[PDB]
Design a protein around this motif. Structure first.
Motif, PDB file in Angstrom:
ATOM      1  N   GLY B  32       0.525  14.075  -5.428  1.00  0.00           N
ATOM      2  CA  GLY B  32       1.315  12.911  -5.792  1.00  0.00           C
ATOM      3  C   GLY B  32       0.572  12.037  -6.781  1.00  0.00           C
ATOM      4  N   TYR B  33       1.043  12.012  -8.024  1.00  0.00           N
ATOM      5  CA  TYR B  33       0.394  11.224  -9.065  1.00  0.00           C
ATOM      6  C   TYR B  33       1.412  10.976 -10.165  1.00  0.00           C
ATOM      7  N   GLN B  34       1.162   9.945 -10.980  1.00  0.00           N
ATOM      8  CA  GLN B  34       2.098   9.650 -12.060  1.00  0.00           C
ATOM      9  C   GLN B  34       1.360   9.055 -13.248  1.00  0.00           C
ATOM     10  N   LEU B  35       1.633   9.588 -14.444  1.00  0.00           N
ATOM     11  CA  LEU B  35       1.084   9.114 -15.714  1.00  0.00           C
ATOM     12  C   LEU B  35       2.222   8.641 -16.612  1.00  0.00           C
ATOM     13  N   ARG B  36       1.951   7.685 -17.505  1.00  0.00           N
ATOM     14  CA  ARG B  36       2.984   7.408 -18.496  1.00  0.00           C
ATOM     15  C   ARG B  36       2.370   6.987 -19.824  1.00  0.00           C
TER      16      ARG B  36
END
Lengths: 248, 248
Positions: B32-36
């Motif tokens: 579970g991870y998020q980049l933007r």
């Protein structure tokens, strides 16, 4: 507690983009967000549970007719059913009976649970509701598009991808639903509970709810309740409503 | 620049869980991870581009045989093809020709672009590669399971859900691929470029790469390059390799 959910509410209020539906109803929205909860620290639900539980039991039965819900006093899908109570091949049908070409049907719940048990290091423990060719037959397109499990150090985690969310009215229910699914699957696979991860596409608040949101943002946070499942359930299809108790 | 990607590398090193494949190969992983990335601030790629571009053009053609790649000097799929060069119904086949029951086929790329243009406020601008019933016919299960577009204030955004990622070796390529797709779709739909959002299930680093990762973490960050597309392309299927130039 759930300060991360409060931060999401505030972010949309401060930085979201305003839009208007054809019916003139305004929303303010952001795109791309992620929440997570360590389920060993409590169940991520503030204050209803009866609709959450029966809807999950309904999904796991593979049912897409609302009769089971109505017979248990649950009306949350009534507005979308046809005159026979049918919704077409929505969640329950994809979870238990995903239909493809050449008469291929896939029971994704049974498959993924078998793989958690037998291949816990799998990097593809996925259930999808986004059955492209069947979406036109559904009463509406799946909001909860797919989810993925993960095992590490004896703990089971789950991540949901939700394409669109009403953060004020829907997201508390949405979080509780899939966190409870994680607790249920962890129990029947013999694992301890890990993290619930909730990823979002569109996140919105209706402009008419800004006052209510600001009031919830200024409320003192309470401890999370504890969700206790009947430890005698060893099969994901063997849960009943009385097997759930939310405490504290 | 891409400090968020560096933070992901460090997080896995510091806090990831160690695992071992059947072949004895070790990994350390998080879930579970998020980049933007705001694509108006530069293209999120450090330093190759030829494989990225030809693979995307191949996807958009609907091709799942490697001949087009090999004829353009691109070997990244060679190891998975059968003796005829076939991969089964992987990305290109799902993007352009998702196969369901009753001879239903769906060109998801054409549909989603038409909906960006005609219904930009849509909360279901989704392409999925996770065609459950067809995955056994694929050379491997899709790593890039689905993606979703979003329009606000004249800017087009894209979010990818990736089920599993080698953060050191694969993720730089993965980010560049779908950020470039966003730039291509933004151009042919007449929109300005918004955010690229990259959500992850399993994220891992191989234990054998820890030294290389630590060295990249201590490197001085450089400015992002600029990706310039031929402004004359108005159709997503009309891009060619020479229509792309990465500058600075």
């Amino acid at each position: 507690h759930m300060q991360n959910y409060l931060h999401l509410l505030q972010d949309i209020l401060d930085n979201g983009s305003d839009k208007t539906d054809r019916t003139g109803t305004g929303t303010r929205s952001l795109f791309g967000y992620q929440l997570r909860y360590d389920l060993s620290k409590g169940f991520p639900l503030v204050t209803h549970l009866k609709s959450i539980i029966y809807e999950l039991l309904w999904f796991l039965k593979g049912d897409t007719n609302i009769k089971y819900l109505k017979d248990n006093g649950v009306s949350i899908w009534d507005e979308w059913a046809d005159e026979n109570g049918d919704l077409g091949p929505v969640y329950g049908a994809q979870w238990r009976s995903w239909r493809g070409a050449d008469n291929k049907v896939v029971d994704q719940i049974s498959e993924v649970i078998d793989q958690i048990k037998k291949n816990p290091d799998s990097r593809r423990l996925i259930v999808s509701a986004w059955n492209v060719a069947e979406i036109p037959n559904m009463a509406l397109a799946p909001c909860h598009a797919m989810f993925q499990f993960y095992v590490a150090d004896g703990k089971l985690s789950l991540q949901l991808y939700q394409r669109s969310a009403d953060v004020f009215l829907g997201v508390p229910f949405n979080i509780a639903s899939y966190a409870l699914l994680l607790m249920m699957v962890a129990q029947v696979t013999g694992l301890q509970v890990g993290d619930y991860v909730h990823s979002f596409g569109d996140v919105h608040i209706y402009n008419n709810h800004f006052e209510q949101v600001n009031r919830q943002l200024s409320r003192d946070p309470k401890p999370l309740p504890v969700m206790k499942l009947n430890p005698d359930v060893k099969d994901i299809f063997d849960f009943k409503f009385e097997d759930f108790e939310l405490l504290n």
